[PDB]
Design an enzyme around this catalytic site. Structure first.
Site, PDB file in Angstrom:
ATOM      1  N   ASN A 124      -2.161  -0.643   6.550  1.00  0.00           N
ATOM      2  CA  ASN A 124      -2.823  -0.098   5.931  1.00  0.00           C
ATOM      3  C   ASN A 124      -4.398  -1.063   6.075  1.00  0.00           C
ATOM      4  OD1 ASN A 124      -4.306   0.644   3.426  1.00  0.00           O
ATOM      5  ND2 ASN A 124      -2.532  -0.046   1.841  1.00  0.00           N
ATOM      6  N   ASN A 174       4.607 -10.291  12.695  1.00  0.00           N
ATOM      7  CA  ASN A 174       6.240 -10.881  11.716  1.00  0.00           C
ATOM      8  C   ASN A 174       6.480 -10.285  11.389  1.00  0.00           C
ATOM      9  OD1 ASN A 174       7.690 -13.056  12.791  1.00  0.00           O
ATOM     10  ND2 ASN A 174       8.110 -13.224  10.643  1.00  0.00           N
ATOM     11  N   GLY A 181       0.438  -1.359   0.077  1.00  0.00           N
ATOM     12  CA  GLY A 181       0.280  -0.024  -0.002  1.00  0.00           C
ATOM     13  C   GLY A 181       0.899   1.350  -0.422  1.00  0.00           C
ATOM     14  N   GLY A 200      -0.015 -12.536   9.060  1.00  0.00           N
ATOM     15  CA  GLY A 200       1.691 -13.140   9.211  1.00  0.00           C
ATOM     16  C   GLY A 200       1.954 -11.141   9.860  1.00  0.00           C
ATOM     17  N   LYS A 231       8.991   9.543  -6.754  1.00  0.00           N
ATOM     18  CA  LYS A 231       9.330   7.673  -6.994  1.00  0.00           C
ATOM     19  C   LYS A 231      10.292   8.068  -7.758  1.00  0.00           C
ATOM     20  CE  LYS A 231       7.811   3.080  -7.105  1.00  0.00           C
ATOM     21  NZ  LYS A 231       7.607   2.161  -5.321  1.00  0.00           N
ATOM     22  N   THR A 242      10.829  -0.715 -10.850  1.00  0.00           N
ATOM     23  CA  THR A 242      10.938  -1.235 -11.359  1.00  0.00           C
ATOM     24  C   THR A 242       8.896  -1.619 -12.214  1.00  0.00           C
ATOM     25  OG1 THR A 242      10.641  -3.081  -9.772  1.00  0.00           O
ATOM     26  CG2 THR A 242      12.718  -1.874 -10.086  1.00  0.00           C
ATOM     27  N   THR A 250       2.347   3.271  -2.464  1.00  0.00           N
ATOM     28  CA  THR A 250       1.522   4.120  -3.745  1.00  0.00           C
ATOM     29  C   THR A 250       0.428   4.718  -3.141  1.00  0.00           C
ATOM     30  OG1 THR A 250       3.030   3.713  -5.211  1.00  0.00           O
ATOM     31  CG2 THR A 250       1.048   4.599  -5.588  1.00  0.00           C
ATOM     32  N   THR A 251      -0.900   3.534  -2.539  1.00  0.00           N
ATOM     33  CA  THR A 251      -2.083   4.599  -2.179  1.00  0.00           C
ATOM     34  C   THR A 251      -1.766   5.042  -0.265  1.00  0.00           C
ATOM     35  OG1 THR A 251      -2.907   2.176  -3.137  1.00  0.00           O
ATOM     36  CG2 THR A 251      -4.556   3.949  -1.997  1.00  0.00           C
TER      37      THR A 251
HETATM   38 MG   LIG Z   1       4.302   1.812  -5.422  1.00  0.00          MG
END
Ligand SMILES: [Mg+2]
Ligand SMILES: Nc1nc2c(ncn2[C@@H]2O[C@H](COP(=O)(O)OP(=O)(O)O)[C@@H](O)[C@H]2O)c(=O)[nH]1
Ligand SMILES: Nc1nc2c(ncn2[C@@H]2O[C@H](COP(=O)(O)OP(=O)(O)O)[C@@H](O)[C@H]2O)c(=O)[nH]1
Ligand SMILES: [Mg+2]
Ligand SMILES: [Mg+2]
Ligand SMILES: [Mg+2]
Lengths: 224, 224
Positions: B179, B158, B16, B155, B39, B43, B18-19
């Site tokens: 998020n 962790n 998350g 998870g 940014k 990639t 970017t959001t």
């Molecule tokens: Mg992103």
């Protein structure tokens, strides 16, 4: 010495601890290294209705060496909740915090009768057992060597390195092994190039589990 | 002082970043805190054919403050390969290792014209940029504060704690924010109980992003 002890943790639940533990114990046993599989703490189980938990699968393999074993001999704290052990314990068994001193004694007793005692954790290294102890702390109390199983998906580099950082910061022998699927050739294109570079630059390389049964048996048994 | 800088990393790609970055910048801008989204490395892109990368979405938001911005003003190293930046760079642009000194200058220049410069990483903290530097190293070079976005699935405990351990071991101000999806109430049952316990026992609590826009803007802007 008495039997060696190898703790198996992972990057994530579902990474492959149980599958890889069973394959490693099978290999060890086939090589004459008498090996038991233990699952001292397990969440998300319902033994009244389901007999396919990690401790059940371990029990099936283990009974090839001792018919007398039962589930309660190899798994000690069992919860219905899908959660960290600490949270399942607080909710389902509030009066009985998990006793890692007792677990250390029970697990070490199996080093009398086995050359290798493989102990599968639950969840990941940082997963809480008690208010004071996580899975890594438990492994440190056990004085076990560590095998950390990684997933083979995008993001394994980051997950492996976060665990490397935590492990190299503590006083235990460890290996990180990727649980590679054979339908996954994206691995070789995307992640393997960095694993190779890392391994030129690290004294403790990240291996592929499926290539590493002999080296991991060696690792588990070496030294005191 | 010149503008503050907040690096946004995550437990995982798709967590998350970017959001959450776009929601935080929108909130900051609505509060009169003039905020740009950058940014620097991305990639998995193909700008000839696709205009929905992180840098494109950032560009759309950013042009509400400066119509003159173009993609090359806010994203500097762009690769087709879905891989860590180091590996994409070695394969697609072998003669041009990513220059984090140059990136530090370019990013800091935006602190002239903005109250807050939000810098989204790629991948996770340990993801390699060069042979010598990962995303955390880049954030440390930048002298940015850190916002680490966690996923809200099983998870997360962790993953959050592995990142906490790495971050608390280095000299930067950070916050970890979950998020949370609103169709996800399993979170509140399974993971939240431990987040609450952790927060009683930690001087740096794990927050829920969606509850935390005001505190995160405060965090980003505080002090020198
Ligand atoms: Mg992103
Ligand atoms: C594979 O992926 C799933 C999870 O693997 P497992 O070996 O149980 O992982 P673990 O949860 O890390 O112990 C199983 O259905 C295996 O057959
Ligand atoms: C959600 O989950 C997916 C990944 O989220 P994003 O904000 O791009 O995550 P990021 O990869 O960590 O930057 C997107 O399709 C979002 O709409
Ligand atoms: Mg499992
Ligand atoms: Mg398992
Ligand atoms: Mg992404």
């Amino acid at each position: 010495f008495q039997g060696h002890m190898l703790f198996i943790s992972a990057t994530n639940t579902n990474a492959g601890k149980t599958t890889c533990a069973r394959l490693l114990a099978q290999y060890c046993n086939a090589c004459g290294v008498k090996t038991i599989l233990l699952k001292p703490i397990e969440t998300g189980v319902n033994d009244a209705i389901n007999h396919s938990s990690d401790a059940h699968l371990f029990l099936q393999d283990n009974r090839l060496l001792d018919r007398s074993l039962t589930l309660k001999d190899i798994s000690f704290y069992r919860y219905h909740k899908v959660s960290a052990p600490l949270i399942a314990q607080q909710e389902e068994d509030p009066n009985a915090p998990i006793d890692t001193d007792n677990l250390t004694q029970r697990l070490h007793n199996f080093t009398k009768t086995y050359d290798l005692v493989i102990v599968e954790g639950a969840g990941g290294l940082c997963v809480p057992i008690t208010l004071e102890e996580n899975m890594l702390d438990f492994a440190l109390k056990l004085k076990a060597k560590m095998l950390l199983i990684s997933h083979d998906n995008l993001g394994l580099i980051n997950d492996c390195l976060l665990n490397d950082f935590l492990l190299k910061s503590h006083q235990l022998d460890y290996k990180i092994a990727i649980n590679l699927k054979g339908n996954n050739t994206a691995f070789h294109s995307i992640s393997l190039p960095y694993i190779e570079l890392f391994n030129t630059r690290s004294n403790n390389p990240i291996v592929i589990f499926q290539q590493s049964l002999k080296v991991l048996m060696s690792f588990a048994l070496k030294g005191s």
